[PDB]
Design an enzyme around this catalytic site. Sequence first.
Site, PDB file in Angstrom:
ATOM      1  N   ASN A  51     -13.337  -2.831   2.448  1.00 26.93           N
ATOM      2  CA  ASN A  51     -14.158  -3.796   1.752  1.00 26.93           C
ATOM      3  C   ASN A  51     -14.763  -3.221   0.470  1.00 26.93           C
ATOM      4  O   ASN A  51     -15.006  -2.009   0.369  1.00 26.93           O
ATOM      5  CB  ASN A  51     -15.258  -4.343   2.659  1.00 26.93           C
ATOM      6  CG  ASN A  51     -15.897  -5.594   2.088  1.00 26.93           C
ATOM      7  OD1 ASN A  51     -15.277  -6.283   1.277  1.00 26.93           O
ATOM      8  ND2 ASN A  51     -17.119  -5.895   2.498  1.00 26.93           N
ATOM      9  N   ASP A 118     -12.085   2.304   6.355  1.00 22.13           N
ATOM     10  CA  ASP A 118     -12.773   1.055   6.667  1.00 22.13           C
ATOM     11  C   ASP A 118     -11.731   0.046   7.185  1.00 22.13           C
ATOM     12  O   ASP A 118     -10.947   0.388   8.060  1.00 22.13           O
ATOM     13  CB  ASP A 118     -13.591   0.612   5.433  1.00 22.13           C
ATOM     14  CG  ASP A 118     -14.416  -0.635   5.662  1.00 22.13           C
ATOM     15  OD1 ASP A 118     -15.323  -0.622   6.521  1.00 22.13           O
ATOM     16  OD2 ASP A 118     -14.161  -1.639   4.950  1.00 22.13           O
ATOM     17  N   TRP A 119     -11.713  -1.182   6.673  1.00 23.45           N
ATOM     18  CA  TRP A 119     -10.782  -2.203   7.140  1.00 23.45           C
ATOM     19  C   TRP A 119      -9.328  -1.861   6.828  1.00 23.45           C
ATOM     20  O   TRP A 119      -8.415  -2.362   7.486  1.00 23.45           O
ATOM     21  CB  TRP A 119     -11.169  -3.564   6.559  1.00 23.45           C
ATOM     22  CG  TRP A 119     -12.332  -4.149   7.269  1.00 23.45           C
ATOM     23  CD1 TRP A 119     -13.617  -4.211   6.842  1.00 23.45           C
ATOM     24  CD2 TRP A 119     -12.308  -4.722   8.571  1.00 23.45           C
ATOM     25  NE1 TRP A 119     -14.407  -4.804   7.800  1.00 23.45           N
ATOM     26  CE2 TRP A 119     -13.619  -5.135   8.870  1.00 23.45           C
ATOM     27  CE3 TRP A 119     -11.295  -4.936   9.512  1.00 23.45           C
ATOM     28  CZ2 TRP A 119     -13.946  -5.744  10.075  1.00 23.45           C
ATOM     29  CZ3 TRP A 119     -11.618  -5.539  10.704  1.00 23.45           C
ATOM     30  CH2 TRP A 119     -12.932  -5.936  10.978  1.00 23.45           C
ATOM     31  N   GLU A 142     -14.046   6.678   8.286  1.00 24.53           N
ATOM     32  CA  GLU A 142     -15.027   5.591   8.251  1.00 24.53           C
ATOM     33  C   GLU A 142     -14.372   4.281   8.671  1.00 24.53           C
ATOM     34  O   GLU A 142     -14.513   3.246   8.009  1.00 24.53           O
ATOM     35  CB  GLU A 142     -15.667   5.479   6.872  1.00 24.53           C
ATOM     36  CG  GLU A 142     -16.616   6.613   6.552  1.00 24.53           C
ATOM     37  CD  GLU A 142     -18.013   6.413   7.114  1.00 24.53           C
ATOM     38  OE1 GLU A 142     -18.531   5.276   7.072  1.00 24.53           O
ATOM     39  OE2 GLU A 142     -18.619   7.404   7.580  1.00 24.53           O
ATOM     40  N   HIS A 283     -20.380   6.507   3.015  1.00 28.39           N
ATOM     41  CA  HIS A 283     -19.272   5.647   3.456  1.00 28.39           C
ATOM     42  C   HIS A 283     -18.059   5.761   2.536  1.00 28.39           C
ATOM     43  O   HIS A 283     -16.934   5.959   2.997  1.00 28.39           O
ATOM     44  CB  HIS A 283     -19.708   4.184   3.566  1.00 28.39           C
ATOM     45  CG  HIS A 283     -18.599   3.267   3.981  1.00 28.39           C
ATOM     46  ND1 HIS A 283     -18.034   3.300   5.240  1.00 28.39           N
ATOM     47  CD2 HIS A 283     -17.934   2.307   3.296  1.00 28.39           C
ATOM     48  CE1 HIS A 283     -17.077   2.388   5.312  1.00 28.39           C
ATOM     49  NE2 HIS A 283     -16.981   1.787   4.139  1.00 28.39           N
TER      50      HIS A 283
END
Length: 307
Positions: A51, A118-119, A142, A283
């Site tokens: 994201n 992440d995603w 992450e 992050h």
Amino acid sequence: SKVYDPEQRKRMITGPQWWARCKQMNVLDSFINYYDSEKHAENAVIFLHGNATSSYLWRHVVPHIEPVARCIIPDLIGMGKSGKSGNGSYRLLDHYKYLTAWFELLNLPKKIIFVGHDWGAALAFHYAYEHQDRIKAIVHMESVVDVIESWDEWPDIEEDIALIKSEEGEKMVLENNFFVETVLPSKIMRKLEPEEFAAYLEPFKEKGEVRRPTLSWPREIPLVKGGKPDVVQIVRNYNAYLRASDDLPKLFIESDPGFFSNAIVEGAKKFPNTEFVKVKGLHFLQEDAPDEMGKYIKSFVERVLKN
């Protein structure tokens, strides 16, 4: 830049400089913007942002890895300089549709390597689950490793996700660009140069629906209580597969002090055949330790390919 500027300015790669090195390819009803190092195409290392970001996130990481394998780095649909989704939906499975259609056009080898954040990691893990014979190795960081329950560092996660799924959450993102203008700079430890932040802002500079992907991603969160059922099932399925994947080499890059890292490292530890390293960051760790990350990934990939 000038010789008297800080090193981070002398090393800066602006948005336009990065975008000029990218290619575009039509994919289904839209198109994907991507970086492709091309050489050493017997392997393919696919780097997936999450994201708020784009392929730009990997610009200082990829130089280290290019010499050992072909590196391919897309802007996910609706993000970066890629096209938009034809039906306006930006759920995990919408992203996965465009990603897999794009793969079919890339002249990939049978087995590929993923580097996911992440995603982006969720997309890699789901692809792996569905194509278990097409995965050589996975690097993650992450990442969405498992379904999520309220925990010590984040006791009111259900409430925060309720907020992001509400109309006020919609205002925060579509009107105020919460994830790009607030969260992104907050979870990078260093200062971004103005041109670096501008590269992240550019796709989402306008108010409204263009910002939808940055709202849709957190709304996919696989909460055990409240999670989208299709995503919850996807994550349950790939988590079980990953826990049993003794023959699949993995690298987990922990951020120090990290954001999700401390909460998810125990999850990552449940996957066998994982090498663990640690780099500086919160992050968006690619902005705080890209060179250390790139070197650790290069080393891992080299040894995977040799062994």
